[PDB]
RNA sequence: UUACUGUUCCCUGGGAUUGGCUUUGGGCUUUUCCUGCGCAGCUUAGGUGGAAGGCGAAGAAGGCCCCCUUCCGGGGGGGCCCGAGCCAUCAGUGAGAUACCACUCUGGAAGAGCUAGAAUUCUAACCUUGUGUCAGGACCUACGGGCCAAGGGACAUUCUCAGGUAGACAGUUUCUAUGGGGCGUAGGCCUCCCAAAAGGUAACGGAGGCGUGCAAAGGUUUCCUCGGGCCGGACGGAGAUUGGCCCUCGAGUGCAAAGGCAGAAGGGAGCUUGACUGCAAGACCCACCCGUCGAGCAGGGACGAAAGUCGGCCUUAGUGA
RNA sequence: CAGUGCCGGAAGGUCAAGGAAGUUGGUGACCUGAUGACAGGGGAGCCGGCGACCGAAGCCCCGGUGAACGGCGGCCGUAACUAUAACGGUCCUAAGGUAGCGAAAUUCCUUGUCGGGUAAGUUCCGACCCGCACGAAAGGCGUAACGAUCUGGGCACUGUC
RNA sequence: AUCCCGUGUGAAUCAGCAAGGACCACCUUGCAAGGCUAAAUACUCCUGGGUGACCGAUAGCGAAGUAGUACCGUGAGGGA
RNA sequence: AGACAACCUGGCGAACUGAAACAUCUUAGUAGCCAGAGGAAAAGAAAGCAAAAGCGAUUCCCGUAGUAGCGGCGAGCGAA
């Protein structure tokens, strides 16, 4: 019926699958909620933090 | 079987004096198709009113 | 209660809670091909365009061979060999080259995207447990809270939507005349009697049918008379078809009865579509609703030579606001 | 093991919500006809209609299961006198009642017929089976003991008479 | 159609968005997803004045004295 | 904090009844129950009506009007 969107993440730690600490490979919102955001492992791409830093 | 069915003329959607399709109630047709000469259509003389 | 409409428990699917890896793998694509028996023919005419030039020796015709759809008719290249051609308007031909390609087709592949479904697992969501550990003035081996551990695990749980589904539960209905009942019958329309010579008239009084059918069994013009007894004619008889007399309406009319109808309203033949449109003075019936008949007018016709007749049927039933 | 219930099964058919190729409609910048008082066609955008195909359980289907629901038949004929049916054929079902019981808390006819008990017994007991309309866990047939149970008879006993 | 919610998807800022009864085009009107406000307004367990073609002890409040009292009910409550 | 007759707001929310039965509908978002709060409460300052003419927050009364409608187009319901 419907598909849920994909949320952007910017890394802070080496993914054992795809990304080494700095890539912008966007995966899933639930993979950010349950796994990446509590473990200090990814962040949300915001223009206030990415563009000026 | 005695199917009820409508006879109809030739359509001619035009802007004449009330020109429109004319269908008439008729019965008995469980046979070959019978166009009868029912008339006084919107065009006043008419023949071979089909179906 | 297998009456109606539902509800609930429960089950089952789409969403959400809901994520990670790889396989099996159905539909779309990311480029190229093997690929096509209407014709006379070097040839199994892939619908179009670029068309005197390409493949070539970074090694072409023709001989050694693996493979396949197959109408085994005919083809493709992997290896080796061979050593300077395959032509190109040719005449056939709506449309042409197996010199060449941008496209792309009935069939599939190469490595890749996208989406199913199903399966494998991991833990981080979520669920369960812990007389495992820590905690305050003290305990929580008293529910519980933090931490840790184990078992599951994107399943289960919860929510919405959708299908199914239990009188478990809820609201209801379950006719009347009658014999004031199981056991029956009928409910509406038409014909005769009862019905007492206008019309009407009841009873679960006496008898029957109807819920249609006909492109003619409607319309018009025209012609004709059936029905029964007797007599004649090796099929053929009591009785078929034919001839003649007698009785003259007893026959017939799509079907029940009544009233009608004999040169007919009964039977046949020709032409036919009035089994139209817009109507309509006045009547009958009349609780209302309804229902029935109708002179006459206009248009456009059918038959007939005309006169005239025709707004369905000899009429009354064949129906529903 | 037919119908119903319950269980199991997956091949197929039917199949909701929803997804979706495609098709179609309205409006519409713009282009055309127009002795009419207007009209025809239509890009994109927006709003819709139908919808091939996918789409689970249920249901149809298949197989099992009577201490699951329940049901367990008619028709006649023939054996050395009268009989009666061991036996036979036929129709229809899913199958046609097995042991035991049987005028019974079940029998309408019926106070069936016989025997016992009684002077006399529509009540009682023992039999036959013509079981209107017994019957095997809605169990069937029995029995010791028991019952303010029902019912038949007898002794003693008495105003019940 | 307007308005508000349940599940799920999910915009634009004024060159816009919403409404004008499906919807589209033009025009008109207004600026949601932030809050607060007196008056006119409805009523009487009452209070203070004025009335009554309202009652006069079976009436008027149930109740003109102990009146929600005696009495009844376990109680809710009923009730002179 | 608790109490408060009625009005008011918010939530749960019927059924007898009417339809000459009854299920859509009505009775009815009424009664009742709970919560809250004031002498009033709610609402209230246009993402509003209207129609090419115009008005300017909310509330209440007369009217339109028993009109337009809605409805087993029944019983009834009824604006702006």
């Amino acid at each position: 019926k419907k598909v849920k969107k994909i949320r952007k993440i910017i890394l802070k730690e080496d993914i054992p699958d795809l990304g080494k600490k700095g890539q912008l490979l966007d995966v899933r919102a639930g993979f950010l909620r349950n796994f990446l955001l509590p473990l200090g492992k990814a962040e949300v791409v915001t223009p206030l933090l990415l563009k000026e830093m | 079987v005695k199917v009820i069915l409508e006879c109809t003329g030739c359509v001619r959607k035009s802007v004449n004096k009330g020109s429109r399709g004319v269908s008439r109630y008729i019965t008995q047709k469980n046979r070959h198709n019978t166009p009868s000469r029912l008339e006084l259509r919107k065009f006043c003389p008419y023949c071979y009113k089909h179906t």
Side-chain angles (χ1 to χ4, degrees):
Chain A
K1 182 173 73 175
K2 298 291 185 181
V3 65
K4 191 177 184 293
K5 299 185 292 293
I6 294 170
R7 189 174 296 276
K8 293 185 178 181
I9 50 97
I10 177 64
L11 296 174
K12 290 178 70 67
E13 198 271 331
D14 194 0
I15 304 295
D17 194 4
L18 53 93
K20 296 183 290 294
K21 192 182 183 294
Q23 297 301 110
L24 281 76
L25 276 75
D26 303 328
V27 279
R28 187 63 64 86
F31 183 67
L32 174 60
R33 288 178 287 167
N34 297 320
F35 186 74
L36 295 175
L37 186 63
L39 290 174
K41 188 168 170 64
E43 291 179 353
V44 177
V45 175
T46 61
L48 187 63
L49 187 64
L50 182 64
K51 291 183 182 292
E52 68 182 2
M53 182 178 176
Chain B
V1 181
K2 289 291 290 182
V3 176
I4 49 96
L5 65 317
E6 63 272 12
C7 295
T8 184
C10 297
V11 282
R12 289 187 295 269
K13 275 79 173 176
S14 65
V15 198
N16 296 114
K17 189 184 286 185
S19 67
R20 65 180 179 88
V22 170
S23 298
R24 288 182 181 177
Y25 61 95
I26 210 164
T27 184
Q28 185 53 257
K29 190 179 79 69
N30 294 115
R31 299 288 188 268
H32 185 73
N33 194 0
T34 59
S36 295
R37 293 183 69 252
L38 278 309
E39 60 181 358
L40 205 293
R41 199 185 174 274
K42 299 298 178 181
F43 292 101
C44 297
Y46 189 71
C47 56
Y48 59 98
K49 189 177 262 76
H50 190 72
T51 299

